[PDB]
Design a protein around this ligand. Structure first.
Ligand SMILES: O=C(O)C1=C[C@@H](OP(=O)(O)O)[C@@H](O)[C@H](O[C@@](OP(=O)(O)O)(C(=O)O)C(F)F)C1
Length: 427
């Protein structure tokens, strides 16, 4: 078991050029593969989730080339649905943005493909998506536990009236939205009730528009899609920097700055996690907005009590930043933390208590009362990139912290610790 020990960081200050957005990167790659023409993506993220998507596209027959640093990709569009037979297995690692979107897209036409991944992926739900795809005509088989990967897809999604549950993940609706335009018949997608992580649907619709497709969004309760469409290459496309990855560095400044500026995202970004900056401002930090940067300067840090459903991933960063705030912080309406890279409510509460906090682990919320002073802990990371990045902030105090399995950050940010060190100052 590898580990990394972070010594106390006296102050943070500096500029970080953000790695590419994982959410945008995987959507752009799949749309480029389905599109007609050559797409040149720049500022593409090089991480495990993107590598698994690229490997899947290679296995499906898509041609592309990558630059030396793997941030520039020239993709040759397939000009329509991707195809493979013989129960070809695509191993998708831990990537939800490959698993959910491909589970839907590969249901177009006739195929015989199996989707699987790491053990944890076999524990992340996909039943709501499968239910919707079947209503549209798809033939899908669960090879292990019902409602979870791995899946054998045999095609048949033609469109029609499809209902989808949006209460657990926005990725199921995202997958349907990307797939429906290419189906032969028109599709009306009806949301059964609530829709969580709503800002990610805006990311999906933005990418679809870039690739030539628009749909009718009726107040996020129903989406009307015309079938028989085709995606078209936009030529060159610049991938936004990752706003979720930015959260760690902006929070670092709110706690121990200094001023930290992140470039690659700004006030015009399509990512919902830029709203993380507004939470730091509510806590007492100073935020500066630019067209291609967001910066945070240390002010003060006061506890908050907020519904975080609109920024579930960046909300985890507030949970460790809360260790440094005045008062008790409560983060609400975050049930799906339980079904991601690990059960994050269980994990976050467990590890926060290890450094001294008093924590109430609610079914769908977490309440955190910081200790007078933090203590040392060897932090378990649950094969979850965000547990490692969130707990790295413990070192912005008088105590060191040891992070187990630091390489798990590679899901979205292989160079995380090098970047945190770049802004760490001794004076
Ligand atoms: O559509 C997207 O791009 C995502 C939407 C969210 O999921 P929900 O709609 O289910 O709330 C994020 O939490 C998810 O990021 C994570 O990763 P995956 O891409 O799903 O593997 C993450 O980086 O931590 C997370 F869900 F674990 C990526």
């Amino acid at each position: 078991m590898e580990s990394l020990t972070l010594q106390p960081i006296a102050r943070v200050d500096g500029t970080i050029n953000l790695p590419g957005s994982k959410s945008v990167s995987n959507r752009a790659l799949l749309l480029a593969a389905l599109a007609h023409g050559k797409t040149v993506l720049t500022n593409l993220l090089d991480s495990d989730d993107v590598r698994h998507m690229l490997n899947a596209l290679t296995a499906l027959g898509v041609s592309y080339t990558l630059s030396a640093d793997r941030t520039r990709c020239e993709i040759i569009g397939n000009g329509g649905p991707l195809h493979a037979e013989g129960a070809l297995e695509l191993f998708l690692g831990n990537a939800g943005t490959a698993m959910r979107p491909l589970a839907a897209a590969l249901c177009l036409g006739s195929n015989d493909i199996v989707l699987t991944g790491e053990p944890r992926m076999k524990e992340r739900p996909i039943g709501h998506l499968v239910d919707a795809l079947r209503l549209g005509g798809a033939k899908i088989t669960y090879l292990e536990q019902e409602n979870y990967p791995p899946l054998r897809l045999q095609g048949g999604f033609t469109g029609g009236n499809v209902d989808v549950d949006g209460s657990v993940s926005s990725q199921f609706l995202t997958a349907l939205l990307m797939t429906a335009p290419l189906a032969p018949e028109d599709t009306v997608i009806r949301i059964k009730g609530d829709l969580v992580s709503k800002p990610y649907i805006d990311i999906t619709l933005n990418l679809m528009k870039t690739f030539g497709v628009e749909i009718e969004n009726q107040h996020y309760q129903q989406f009307v899609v015309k079938g028989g469409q085709s995606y078209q290459s936009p030529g060159t496309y610049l991938v936004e920097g990752d706003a979720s990855s930015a959260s760690y560095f902006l929070a670092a400044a709110a706690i121990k700055g200094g001023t930290v500026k992140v470039t690659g995202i700004g006030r015009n970004s399509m990512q919902g996690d830029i709203r993380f900056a507004d939470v730091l401002e509510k806590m007492g930090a100073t935020i500066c907005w630019g067209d291609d940067y967001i910066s945070c300067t240390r002010g003060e840090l006061n506890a908050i009590d907020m519904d975080m459903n609109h920024i579930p991933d960046a909300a985890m960063t507030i949970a460790t930043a809360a260790l440094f705030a005045k008062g008790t912080t409560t983060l609400r309406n975050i049930y799906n933390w339980r079904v991601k890279e690990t059960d994050r409510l269980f994990a976050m509460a467990t590890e926060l208590r290890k450094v001294g906090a008093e924590v109430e682990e609610g079914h769908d919320y977490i309440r955190i009362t910081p200790p007078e002073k933090l203590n040392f802990a060897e932090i378990a990371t649950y094969n979850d990139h965000r547990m490692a990045m969130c707990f790295s902030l413990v070192a912005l105090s008088d105590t060191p912290v040891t992070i187990l399995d630091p390489k798990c950050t590679a899901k979205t940010f292989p160079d995380y610790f090098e970047q945190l060190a770049r802004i760490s100052q001794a004076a």
